[PDB]
Each structure stands twice: as C-alpha cells, then as structure tokens.
Design a protein around this motif. Structure first.
Motif, PDB file in Angstrom:
ATOM      1  N   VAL A   7       0.733  -1.111  -0.093  1.00  0.00           N
ATOM      2  CA  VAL A   7       0.048  -0.098  -0.204  1.00  0.00           C
ATOM      3  C   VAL A   7       0.859   1.240   0.164  1.00  0.00           C
ATOM      4  O   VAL A   7       0.423   2.395  -0.677  1.00  0.00           O
ATOM      5  CB  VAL A   7      -1.043  -0.136   1.109  1.00  0.00           C
ATOM      6  N   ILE A   8       1.893   1.334   0.940  1.00  0.00           N
ATOM      7  CA  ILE A   8       2.789   2.503   1.067  1.00  0.00           C
ATOM      8  C   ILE A   8       3.523   2.628  -0.296  1.00  0.00           C
ATOM      9  O   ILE A   8       3.705   3.826  -0.731  1.00  0.00           O
ATOM     10  CB  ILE A   8       3.771   2.184   2.140  1.00  0.00           C
ATOM     11  N   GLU A   9       4.016   1.569  -0.913  1.00  0.00           N
ATOM     12  CA  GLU A   9       4.650   1.612  -2.427  1.00  0.00           C
ATOM     13  C   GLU A   9       3.607   2.249  -3.436  1.00  0.00           C
ATOM     14  O   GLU A   9       4.150   3.101  -4.333  1.00  0.00           O
ATOM     15  CB  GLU A   9       5.123   0.275  -2.901  1.00  0.00           C
ATOM     16  N   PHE A  10       2.502   1.959  -3.502  1.00  0.00           N
ATOM     17  CA  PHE A  10       1.592   2.442  -4.466  1.00  0.00           C
ATOM     18  C   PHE A  10       1.121   3.927  -3.981  1.00  0.00           C
ATOM     19  O   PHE A  10       1.337   4.631  -4.903  1.00  0.00           O
ATOM     20  CB  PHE A  10       0.121   1.673  -4.165  1.00  0.00           C
ATOM     21  N   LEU A  11       1.123   4.215  -2.901  1.00  0.00           N
ATOM     22  CA  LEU A  11       0.959   5.771  -2.438  1.00  0.00           C
ATOM     23  C   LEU A  11       1.969   6.536  -2.742  1.00  0.00           C
ATOM     24  O   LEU A  11       1.922   7.601  -3.237  1.00  0.00           O
ATOM     25  CB  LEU A  11       0.760   5.864  -0.909  1.00  0.00           C
ATOM     26  N   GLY A 104      -3.835  -0.059  -8.835  1.00  0.00           N
ATOM     27  CA  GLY A 104      -3.704   0.021  -7.429  1.00  0.00           C
ATOM     28  C   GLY A 104      -4.948  -0.030  -6.635  1.00  0.00           C
ATOM     29  O   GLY A 104      -5.117  -0.725  -5.536  1.00  0.00           O
ATOM     30  N   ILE A 105      -6.099   0.476  -7.002  1.00  0.00           N
ATOM     31  CA  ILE A 105      -7.167   0.358  -6.335  1.00  0.00           C
ATOM     32  C   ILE A 105      -7.725  -1.038  -6.199  1.00  0.00           C
ATOM     33  O   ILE A 105      -8.109  -1.568  -5.159  1.00  0.00           O
ATOM     34  CB  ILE A 105      -8.532   1.082  -6.773  1.00  0.00           C
ATOM     35  N   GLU A 106      -7.646  -2.039  -7.156  1.00  0.00           N
ATOM     36  CA  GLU A 106      -8.022  -3.142  -7.237  1.00  0.00           C
ATOM     37  C   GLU A 106      -7.053  -4.184  -6.365  1.00  0.00           C
ATOM     38  O   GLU A 106      -7.399  -4.542  -5.157  1.00  0.00           O
ATOM     39  CB  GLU A 106      -7.796  -3.947  -8.371  1.00  0.00           C
ATOM     40  N   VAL A 107      -5.530  -4.064  -6.313  1.00  0.00           N
ATOM     41  CA  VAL A 107      -4.860  -4.892  -5.535  1.00  0.00           C
ATOM     42  C   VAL A 107      -4.882  -4.188  -4.056  1.00  0.00           C
ATOM     43  O   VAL A 107      -4.623  -4.959  -3.146  1.00  0.00           O
ATOM     44  CB  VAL A 107      -3.444  -4.598  -6.037  1.00  0.00           C
ATOM     45  N   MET A 108      -5.410  -2.953  -3.851  1.00  0.00           N
ATOM     46  CA  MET A 108      -5.415  -2.425  -2.426  1.00  0.00           C
ATOM     47  C   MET A 108      -6.821  -3.007  -2.001  1.00  0.00           C
ATOM     48  O   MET A 108      -6.652  -3.700  -0.838  1.00  0.00           O
ATOM     49  CB  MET A 108      -5.226  -1.053  -2.456  1.00  0.00           C
ATOM     50  N   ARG A 109      -7.825  -2.747  -2.306  1.00  0.00           N
ATOM     51  CA  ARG A 109      -9.158  -3.240  -1.799  1.00  0.00           C
ATOM     52  C   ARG A 109      -9.159  -4.586  -1.878  1.00  0.00           C
ATOM     53  O   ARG A 109      -9.990  -5.202  -0.900  1.00  0.00           O
ATOM     54  CB  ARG A 109     -10.435  -2.673  -2.645  1.00  0.00           C
ATOM     55  N   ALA A 110      -8.199  -5.407  -2.451  1.00  0.00           N
ATOM     56  CA  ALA A 110      -8.202  -6.691  -2.165  1.00  0.00           C
ATOM     57  C   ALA A 110      -7.519  -7.188  -0.683  1.00  0.00           C
ATOM     58  O   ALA A 110      -7.189  -8.171  -0.570  1.00  0.00           O
ATOM     59  CB  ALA A 110      -7.582  -7.578  -3.271  1.00  0.00           C
ATOM     60  N   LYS A 111      -7.297  -6.021   0.183  1.00  0.00           N
ATOM     61  CA  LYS A 111      -6.537  -6.617   1.456  1.00  0.00           C
ATOM     62  C   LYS A 111      -6.917  -5.792   2.377  1.00  0.00           C
ATOM     63  O   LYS A 111      -6.517  -5.667   3.679  1.00  0.00           O
ATOM     64  CB  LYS A 111      -5.175  -5.881   1.254  1.00  0.00           C
ATOM     65  N   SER A 116      -8.053   4.500   1.780  1.00  0.00           N
ATOM     66  CA  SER A 116      -6.988   4.557   0.602  1.00  0.00           C
ATOM     67  C   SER A 116      -7.804   4.305  -0.583  1.00  0.00           C
ATOM     68  O   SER A 116      -7.639   4.897  -1.636  1.00  0.00           O
ATOM     69  CB  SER A 116      -5.663   3.802   0.712  1.00  0.00           C
ATOM     70  N   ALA A 117      -8.614   3.273  -0.622  1.00  0.00           N
ATOM     71  CA  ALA A 117      -9.345   2.887  -1.986  1.00  0.00           C
ATOM     72  C   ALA A 117     -10.127   4.165  -2.225  1.00  0.00           C
ATOM     73  O   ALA A 117     -10.366   4.345  -3.429  1.00  0.00           O
ATOM     74  CB  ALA A 117     -10.201   1.802  -1.804  1.00  0.00           C
ATOM     75  N   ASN A 118     -10.832   4.784  -1.211  1.00  0.00           N
ATOM     76  CA  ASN A 118     -11.776   5.785  -1.474  1.00  0.00           C
ATOM     77  C   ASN A 118     -10.997   6.902  -2.176  1.00  0.00           C
ATOM     78  O   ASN A 118     -11.412   7.715  -3.082  1.00  0.00           O
ATOM     79  CB  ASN A 118     -12.668   5.964  -0.245  1.00  0.00           C
ATOM     80  N   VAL A 119      -9.743   7.107  -1.380  1.00  0.00           N
ATOM     81  CA  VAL A 119      -8.924   8.339  -2.055  1.00  0.00           C
ATOM     82  C   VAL A 119      -8.716   8.064  -3.450  1.00  0.00           C
ATOM     83  O   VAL A 119      -8.644   8.930  -4.239  1.00  0.00           O
ATOM     84  CB  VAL A 119      -7.699   8.331  -1.072  1.00  0.00           C
ATOM     85  N   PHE A 120      -8.117   6.946  -3.798  1.00  0.00           N
ATOM     86  CA  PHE A 120      -7.898   6.801  -5.389  1.00  0.00           C
ATOM     87  C   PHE A 120      -9.086   6.724  -6.128  1.00  0.00           C
ATOM     88  O   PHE A 120      -9.043   7.248  -7.390  1.00  0.00           O
ATOM     89  CB  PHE A 120      -7.379   5.089  -5.405  1.00  0.00           C
TER      90      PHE A 120
END
Ligand code: HEM
Ligand code: HEM
Ligand code: HEM
Ligand code: FE2
Ligand code: FE2
Ligand code: FE2
Ligand code: FE2
Ligand code: FE2
Ligand code: FE2
Lengths: 159, 158, 157, 157, 158, 157
Positions: A7-11, A104-111, A116-120
């Motif tokens: 998550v931090i890497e994507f951000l 990123g939204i996909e791979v993140m909300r899968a965890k 963060s998903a909403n921000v994206f």
C-alpha cells in the motif's frame, strides 16, 4: 496500525506522479502566458493548483499509516512549443496515471484497506474528467485551424 | 552642491529622448484611433502618459543639481501607415534608449553620484518591459495574419 | 536582447535551490503538524509560500532573457526527527544560498546587467532575515530546555 | 424488503458498542471537568456527542430493514483516575470497534447489501481518525511529563 | 477511453426505466391535482422532478464513455383511479428498478469500472428511500380508512 | 554572520551623527515655538521625528551583524538665537553628514556588503532633499527681508 508495505509503495508512486504533474503544469502555464495567450494560462494555472491539492491529500494519507513520504524523486518532464504538443503530453500523462490508479485500487481493496481505496477512487474520477476536457480541446483545434483557433484567446491587457 | 557637467549632459540627452518619445506615441495614438482601431489607441495613450511622467521626474532631478533643462530640442520623429511599421519604429526607439541608459549608468555611478543612477535604473527596467511587449505583439501579428489580427481590435460604440 | 550564458547559469542554479527549499519546507511543515506542534507548522507553511513566490519571480526573469528554465533537477533533501535537527538543516541551506547569491551578484553586475542584480539583492536580504530568525530560535531552544520549549507550542484544539 | 439475519446481527452489535462508548465518554468528561482540566472536558464532550450521532444513524438504518433494535444490553465500562489510564481505555475500545467494523464490512458487502457497507465505511474512517488523535496525545504525555502536561490545561476561571 | 458494450447496455436500460418513471409520475401528479387532492399532487410533482434529474445524470455519464443514448424507447405505463392503485403501481416500478440496479452494480464493478458503480449506488439509495415512503403511506391508508384518509388532504383552492 | 569591524565603525559614526541631529532639531523646535513662530516649530518637529526614525533603523541594522551600538557619544551641538544662524547650523550639519555617507557607501560596497549600502543610499537621498529645502528657505529670507519674512509665520495661539 501499520499499513502493509505494498500500500505504501503504491501511495508513493502516486505521490511522485502528482508532483511531476504539478511541475509540468506550472511550467506550461508560465510559458503560455509569456506569449500573449491568456485564457489558456488561467486554465492551466487552476489545473496546477488542483494537482497541488491532490498531492497534499496523498501526503497526509501516506503519513497517517506510519510511512515515509518520498519528496526526492521525479519522473521525466516534457515540454512543447505549439499547442498540440502540450495537449498531447498532458493526455499521455493522464492516461498513465489512470491506468496506475485502477490497478492500485484493485490490488489494495483486495487487502481490507478501504480509506485509501476511496482516496484513489476520487483521484481517478477527477483525472478522468480532466483527460476528457483535454481530448475535447484537441479535437476542436484539429477541426477549426491552429491560427483561427488561437485567434480567439488573444486579448490585450489593460495598460 | 552642484553636479558635474557630464552628468548634466547625460540627463539632458535622456530628457530630449523621452520628449520625442512622448510626441511620437501621442501622434500614433490619434492616428490609430481615427481608423476604427480602438484598443490599440487606449494602450498607446497609456504608454504616452507613462513617458510623460518619466520626463517630469527627469526634469525635476536635472533641476535639483543647479542645471539648465533643455526644452528646445527634439530628435527625429517617425510615422507609419500599417501596424508593422509603427511597431518597428517604437522598437527601434526603445533599443536606442536602452543602450544610452546603460552607458550612462556606468559612467555616472563611476563618479560617486547615486540617486541619478537609481533613476536611470528604474527607467531602464520600464523600457525593458515595454520593448518586450512590443516584440511579443509583433511576433503575434507575424504569425496570425494582418487582416485576421486586426479583426479582433475593431469595435463600434453607439 | 539575449542575456549572456553565465547569467542564465546563475539564474538556473538559484531556481533549483529555491525549488529544493520549497520541498524541504513543506515536508517539514506537514511532519511537524502531525505531532501536535501547530504554532511551528503555521510559520513553516508561511515560509514555504514565500519561497514559492521567490521561485516564480526567478522563473519569469530567467524566461524574459530568452532562456530555458530547468524544472527537472533537485539538490539533496534533508529530514530530521527532533527540532534541533530541522533547524540545523534549514540554517545550512540558507548559508549556502547566501554565499551563492553574493558571488553571483558580483560576477553579474560586473557585466552591465542591473535588473538581475536587483533581484538577487532582494532575495539576499530576505534569506538573511530568515537565517537570523532561525539562529535566534535555536539559541532559545539551547537555553530553555527541549521539554520546556515544546511545552509552549501545543494547543489541544 | 427484509435484510438477512446476519446483517441485522452485525448492526445490533455495532449499536451496542456505540452505546457503551457514549456512556464511557460522558462519564470521563464529567469526571475530568470536576478536577479542573477543562480543556480536556470540552474535547471529551464533543467526542461523546459525535458518538451519539453515530448511534442515532445506526438505529435508523437497522430499523429501515424491518428489524428490532436492541436498547437493553451494554458491554463492560472502564474508568480510571489519572489521564494515561483514560487514554488507554479509549484506545482499547477504538481498536476493538475498528476490527469489528472491518470484518462486518467484508462479510456484508459479500451479500449484495451496499448502503450498510457505506455506513460502516464512514464509521470506520471516523473511528480511525479518533484513535490516531488518542495515540498522539498519549505519546505527548509520555514525552513531556504529567506535571508539565497538566500545567497547560488548567484555567482558573 | 471506451466503456465496454455491456456497461453501455445496462446504462441504457436504466435510462429508459427512469424516463418511463418520469412520465408516469407527471401523469399521476396532474390527474390527482385535477380532483381536488392537493398535497399528494405537490409530493408527486417533486418526485417527478427528482427522477428527471436522475435521467439527466445517467445520460451525461452514458455519453462520456463514447456511447449512443437511446431517447426513442419507453416501457409500459400504468394508470389508476383510486389511491391504492397508484401507490401499488409505483411500488411495483420501484421494486423492478431496485433489482436491476443491484444486478448491474455487481456485474459492472466486476470489470474495473468504478464511477458508474458509484452512480448506481446513489440511485439505489434514493430508490430505497422512495419505496419506503410508498409502503408507509399504503399501510396508513389500509389502517385509517380511504374516506377518512382523503379527508385530510383537501383544501379550498381547486 | 559577522560584519567586519570597519562596517561597524562607519555604522556607529552615522548613528552618533543622527543622534546629535535629533537633539539639535528638538531644541530648535522648542526654542522657536516659545517665541511665537509657529509653522517653523511644526516643520522642525516633523524633521526631528524623521531623524528619530533614521536612528532607529540604523540601530537595528548595526545590531543584526553582532555589534555593540554606542549610545554614549555626542558631537558638539550648536545653537543660535536668530533664525539665519539656525538655518546655517542645520545646513553645515547636513553637509558633513552627506560627505560621510558617500565615503562610507563607497568603502563599504567595495567589500561585498549590500544591505548596509542600500540603507546608506536611502539616508543619503533624504539628507539631499533636506539640505535642498534649507538652502531654498535661506535664499528666500535673504531676498524678502527678515521683518517681512517673520511677518507671515505668526498666529494668535
Ligand atoms: C506566487 C504565487 C504562487 C506560486 C509561484 C506557487 C507555486 C507553487 C509551487 C511550485 C508549489 C510546489 C509544491 C510542491 O512541489 O510540493 C506550490 C505548492 C502549494 N501551493 Fe502554491 N503557488 C502560488 C500561490 C499559492 C497560494 C497564494 C497558495 C495558498 C494561499 C497556494 C497553495 C499551495 C499549496 C496548498 C501547495 C501544496 C504543495 C504540496 O502539497 O506539495 N499557492 N505552489
Ligand atoms: C497632445 C496632447 C498632450 C501633450 C502634448 C501633453 C504633454 C505633456 C507634457 C510635455 C507633460 C510634462 C512635461 C514636463 O514635465 O516638463 C505632461 C504632463 C501631464 N499631462 Fe499631458 N499632454 C497631453 C495630453 C494630456 C491630457 C489630455 C491630459 C489629461 C486629460 C494630460 C495629463 C497630464 C498628466 C497627468 C501629466 C503628468 C504625468 C505624471 O505626473 O506622471 N495630458 N503632458
Ligand atoms: C411533461 C412535463 C415535463 C417534462 C417531460 C420535463 C422534462 C425534463 C427532463 C427530462 C429534464 C432533465 C432533468 C435532469 O437531468 O435531471 C428536465 C429538467 C428540468 N426540469 Fe423539467 N420537464 C417537465 C416539466 C417541468 C417544468 C414545467 C418545470 C419548471 C417549471 C420543470 C423543472 C425542471 C428543472 C428545474 C430542470 C433542471 C434539471 C437540472 O438542473 O438538473 N420540469 N425536464
Ligand atoms: Fe492529480
Ligand atoms: Fe521613458
Ligand atoms: Fe528563497
Ligand atoms: Fe462511533
Ligand atoms: Fe430514479
Ligand atoms: Fe538623518
């Protein structure tokens, strides 16, 4: 609470992207205003300010999860001379950003991380609107005619 | 106190230059307004007023040092018919003025006179800005097209 | 008119310096506000905005002489954890900037270019004022005591 | 329309949790105000009111799906005497709430119910912000010192 | 970008549904106002306006993805004479819309399109609220009594 | 940041000069107001206030460079009972000040210090203006006639 590393890497990726976008947009705003073209300058200035706000929000979020913001990197910056080149550069940047946002939204909300998903999601909506406007203006310039097009955004200031 | 002669000579030359510039600018303003072209007339009127203020400040200064202002001599004045000619004349005048200002500032500040140097510095900045605007408009006319260019500064009031 | 190459080089270096300073100041502002030290975040935000204005002015000037602004490179950025480290980093940056400004003003006004010299003079005055404030605050922290000092910047609102 | 039983169970659990939180926060607000620490009483009162609004929204939602709100049971309530204990109790409660919210959002949105998922998402964001503030204040107390810290929230008015 | 065909199909179906709903609601508003019943007329008018704006937003979205809105097709429209029949028709329409919205949101968000999913989520919340109000009013009419119920929504304005 | 000694010496000289000027101007203002002459009193009062502002700015600057302001010295003060003598004393003082300012600006800007040079430039402009006014009034008195001149600056109050 400690957000996982991915998550931090994507951000961080998104933060660097928004920073480079801010720089490009401000440079283009100045370089357009210098030549006489005014309304284009105003529009690009507002756009740059919006990207600044984006960067600020992303920094705050990435800092809430006990992370380390990266204010040291920058992706390649592009410049042009005519209008078509500027618009094409901006379109390319926005396309890349959108692709990254979706993945990123996909791979993140899968965890199980939601905020963060909403921000994206918000950032994605905004970037899509912007790319749409860019494409519209480009098609217009293509149809009317470069000279005849410019002929409507040049006004003399009030001395 | 009483400034040396060379400072007074430079001040008088600059004064005469600004006077000729005022005359040219107002003539061009009228001759442009007469044809229908309006916004150019407004801009040129404003510039003429600015040069007037310039001359006023310069004469005050040259008079503070126990000098003799020279309101009797004028340089050559140029006129045109299209826009390109007017802009080119103005550009030439501004270039000459810039060169004179730089040389004068140097030779002057080399003699312990400061206030006159500051006056020249301000005038130099202003003339810089003006020449910049002139060059920009000239390039724009070159690109768009004379007719298509004029087609955006015409108007009627009644 | 076309400014000589060396003037443009000096202007570009100063522009890059101001950019790195903006970045550092904003990062520090956020990282301080996050912990509760608000009254420091306010000051740091104001300083960042001032540096932004500096950058814009330098860009316009370097662009008037038919130049090529360089918005692509940045110098090293420093970060800290306590207050002393932040203040020391800022002091170092300002010292470097001042030295560069002085050398540039000299070598520039030695070539009949006045407006850029005036720009540098203004920037120099401002950077000097700022470094003075930094040194004062650092001495105050040294005297009072980190705990005591921090004890007067928290707000609880 | 009739929400499945499991959604109603999750909603009822969250409602009971918010109720216990309201009770704890108001008790702490009063017990702190009584001693002189006003600037903390204000914050705690505002927090209690926020939790009250949370409870109201959850009740309305759980009632729209043809359910039976449960205003009869409460979880354990904790009290303290110093500040550290109060902050630690609040932190524990918020952690538990966050875990429950996440698990519920997952198991719920896996059954085609969206509005309740959105409600939980909002509640989760808010609780997260709150826990962050709590942790910050706790670390500040740890650093400065109970005496020093308390010395900046007394009013005498 | 270019949204896939299935997303466009779902958007078009929802658009047609909202259009038919607009038509039904306005017809009912007029036909109720004509008889003396006033407050029901006001309420139905407001609801019709809301569904209007719904259709507008859906059209804009379906047009952003390089699509072809379909303003040429309508579903079946129902009319009644008493109040119970009107309320039952509205309830049926809302139920159908809700089911379609849920299925569409699922199949859509399963393909990496988010904004359309959010639009559907908002529309779903609104339709939920509306069906709730309809059911409440229907139960109230069932309890009180048709005549005694109507006896409270009449005014001397006609 | 530590200004060289010579800059500090020049700054101290100028400070002492401005202080003596303040004293002289205020004494003359009072001594003129006492006799009936009013507008002269007002003008001299304003000039004294201006010199006060000058002194304040110079003190601040000389203190920023880690110096030691000297508030203990004073140059010889002059006083005359007539008017012409007052004007002549003021003219002499201003002439001396101007000469010192010019020499100092030169020797200072020859060492890479800019802000102090700018301060001196401003002070020099102001002193120029003042000496001009003094000379004008003196010539007017010379022409009209002391009686005639005095006859236009008297009021009943
Ligand atoms: C002379 C006018 C201005 C200039 C030249 C300017 C330029 C810039 C630049 C270059 C940045 C870069 C930020 C970064 O790289 O991280 C920035 C940041 C920012 N500016 Fe300005 N700006 C101006 C006016 C303003 C004003 C007046 C405000 C607020 C009152 C403002 C709000 C912001 C904000 C919120 C940021 C945040 C940057 C970030 O979060 O990274 N801008 N500005
Ligand atoms: C052909 C028309 C005009 C000519 C030739 C002219 C000429 C001049 C000149 C030579 C001076 C100053 C000379 C000196 O200081 O020794 C001056 C001052 C001035 N005149 Fe004009 N003028 C014209 C039109 C006007 C008009 C119509 C107005 C007002 C409606 C005007 C307002 C002023 C102002 C404001 C100044 C002082 C400017 C400043 O203080 O910056 N001028 N004019
Ligand atoms: C048979 C009667 C009517 C029909 C079929 C009709 C149709 C429509 C439609 C389809 C829209 C698009 C709205 C949207 O995008 O949400 C609209 C807009 C609107 N209508 Fe009507 N209309 C009718 C009567 C009226 C009247 C008489 C008024 C006001 C006096 C009205 C108020 C509005 C307003 C305020 C909008 C603006 C929509 C917006 O800003 O989003 N409607 N109309
Ligand atoms: Fe962005
Ligand atoms: Fe001029
Ligand atoms: Fe700066
Ligand atoms: Fe809550
Ligand atoms: Fe609808
Ligand atoms: Fe003075």
């Amino acid at each position: 609470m400690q957000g996982d590393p991915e998550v931090i890497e994507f951000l961080n990726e998104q933060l660097t992207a928004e920073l480079t976008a801010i720089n490009q947009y401000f440079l283009h705003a100045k370089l357009q205003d210098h030549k006489g073209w005014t309304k284009l300058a105003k529009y690009t200035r507002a756009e740059s300010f919006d990207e600044m706000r984006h960067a600020e929000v992303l920094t705050d979020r990435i800092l809430l999860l006990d992370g380390l913001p990266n204010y040291q990197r920058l992706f390649h910056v592009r410049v042009g001379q005519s209008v078509t080149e500027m618009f094409q550069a901006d379109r390319e940047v926005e396309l890349e950003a959108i692709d990254r946002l979706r993945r990123g939204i996909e791979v993140m909300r899968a965890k199980h991380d939601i905020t963060s998903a909403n921000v994206f999601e918000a950032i994605l909506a905004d970037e899509e609107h912007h790319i749409d406007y860019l494409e519209t203006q480009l098609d217009l310039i293509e149809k009317l005619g470069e000279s005849l097009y410019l002929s409507t955004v040049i006004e003399q200031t009030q001395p």
